[PDB]
């Protein structure tokens, strides 16, 4: 696996819970659950969606791009793993994102998915149904807070000593988005 | 470090040896000479985007590798060869050639091999950059099909799809190879 650190400006421009970009970024961490966990820092990495090419292929969403990644991880079917996502947008439904993830968790039962969204993709009419199907699939869906933002900065960004610097209204956007998710997940 | 595969279009458009792009990509590999391919010591880099406004003038791909050297944890008791698959040939008038050459002198336990996919003649002293790199004990070459195919196989998220050389890949390679050896001739 080739190493590549995410640049500070690309991280901040994409994971700002006030800025909405036409790109989805997906920082992922794999770890094995035992009696304690076993952190597989070997398997850290991130993804974005694939750029479309109208002149003809509409690109591939980051969620699906992680599902293409799973065999490379060579997970033990006997053992159980917890996959952690720090995804830029909450996975959609109108496109086969929430659907394929549901099928994956259903088939590969040895995987627990923990998703941290920076912001909610409400530009998809069925964004509510997306988060709900993920919840039914057994995933932990929640909103990124300062802790999760500082983590990805320390873990995935070429910071070079520079500490994580919170943008204006980071906490307010978190709390606001937490309430919306709390309403969507309220059955 | 975090694993991240380069996208097909990002690779094919940047490492094209006929068309120019505004940023530099640098695929690097490390191997101990005792040769053993030190996989997981490989990855790729791009120049850090400038942000004039907050007076930041970016950082070139070559220099970003130099920052990454202590991360490698190389052994002074061993001997390594670092291979560079770089989009533009390292410049001079902005400090890449001089600082890369200087690194080789401080670190004689490492030998450098540079495969440029394109000659950065935007620098008026682009020839002096290439010559300085050679005089520092580094192989200065031009990316051929072999290197492009290797980068596609190694760094690019090809998803099983084989490497498809763009139009004029071999043609431009020869022309650029003729230019380079004519430069290093002098
Ligand atoms: Cl990138
Ligand atoms: Cl860009
Ligand atoms: Zn990058
Ligand atoms: Zn999406
Ligand atoms: Zn989607
Ligand atoms: Zn990329
Ligand atoms: Zn650009
Ligand atoms: Zn350059
Ligand atoms: Zn330069």
UniProtKB/Swiss-Prot annotation, chain A:
The active site is at residue 63. Induction: Up-regulated by interferon and CpG single-stranded DNA (at protein level). Pfam families: NAD2. Its cofactor is Zn(2+). Residues 20-134 form the CMP/dCMP-type deaminase domain. Expressed in peripheral leukocytes with higher expression in CD14-positive phagocytic cells. Highly expressed in keratinocytes and in periphery blood monocytes. Also detected in non-lymphoid tissues including lung and adipose tissues. Found at high levels in colorectal adenocarcinoma, Burkitt's lymphoma and chronic myelogenous leukemia. Zn(2+) binds at residues 61, 92, 97. Changing residue 97 to S: Altered deaminase activity. Keywords: Antiviral defense, Cytoplasm, Hydrolase, Immunity, Innate immunity, Metal-binding, Nucleus, Zinc. It is an enzyme of class 3 (hydrolase). It comes from the Eukaryota. One of its GO terms (molecular function) is cytidine deaminase activity. One of its GO terms (biological process) is DNA cytosine deamination. Its EC number is 3.5.4.38. GO terms for cellular component: cytoplasm; nucleoplasm; nucleus; P-body. It is found in: Nucleus; Cytoplasm. SUPFAM superfamilies: Cytidine deaminase-like. Changing residue 23 to F: Altered deaminase activity and restriction activity towards genetic invaders. The keyword Acetylation does not apply. InterPro entries: APOBEC/CMP_deaminase_Zn-bd, APOBEC_Cyt_Deaminase, CMP_dCMP_dom, Cytidine_deaminase-like. It catalyses: a 2'-deoxycytidine in single-stranded DNA + H2O + H(+) = a 2'-deoxyuridine in single-stranded DNA + NH4(+). DNA deaminase (cytidine deaminase) with restriction activity against viruses, foreign DNA and mobility of retrotransposons. Exhibits antiviral activity against adeno-associated virus (AAV) and human T-cell leukemia virus type 1 (HTLV-1) and may inhibit the mobility of LTR and non-LTR retrotransposons. Selectively targets single-stranded DNA and can deaminate both methylcytosine and cytosine in foreign DNA. Can induce somatic hypermutation in the nuclear and mitochondrial DNA. May also play a role in the epigenetic regulation of gene expression through the process of active DNA demethylation. Interacts with AGO2. Interacts with TRIB3 (via N-terminus). Belongs to the cytidine and deoxycytidylate deaminase family. It is one of seven related genes or pseudogenes found in a cluster, thought to result from gene duplication, on chromosome 22. This is DNA dC->dU-editing enzyme APOBEC-3A.
């Amino acid at each position: 696996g080739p190493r590549h650190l995410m640049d500070p400006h690309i991280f901040t421009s994409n994971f700002n819970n006030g800025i909405g970009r036409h790109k989805t970024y997906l920082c992922y961490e794999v770890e094995r659950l035992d009696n304690t966990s076993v952190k597989m820092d070997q398997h850290r990495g991130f993804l974005h969606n694939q750029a479309k090419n109208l002149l003809g292929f509409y690109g591939r969403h980051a969620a699906l791009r992680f599902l293409d990644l799973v065999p490379s991880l060579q997970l033990d079917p006997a053992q159980i793993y917890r996959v952690t996502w720090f995804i830029s947008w909450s996975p959609c439904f109108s496109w086969g994102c929430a659907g394929e993830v549901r099928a994956f968790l259903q088939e590969n039962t040895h995987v627990r998915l923990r998703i941290f969204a920076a912001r909610i993709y409400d530009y998809d009419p069925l964004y509510k149904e997306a988060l709900q199907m993920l919840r039914d699939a057994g995933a932990q869906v929640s909103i990124m807070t300062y802790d999760e933002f500082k983590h990805c900065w320390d873990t995935f960004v070429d910071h070079q000593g520079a500490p994580f610097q919170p943008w204006d209204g980071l906490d307010e956007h978190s709390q606001a988005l937490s309430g919306r998710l709390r309403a969507i997940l309220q059955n």
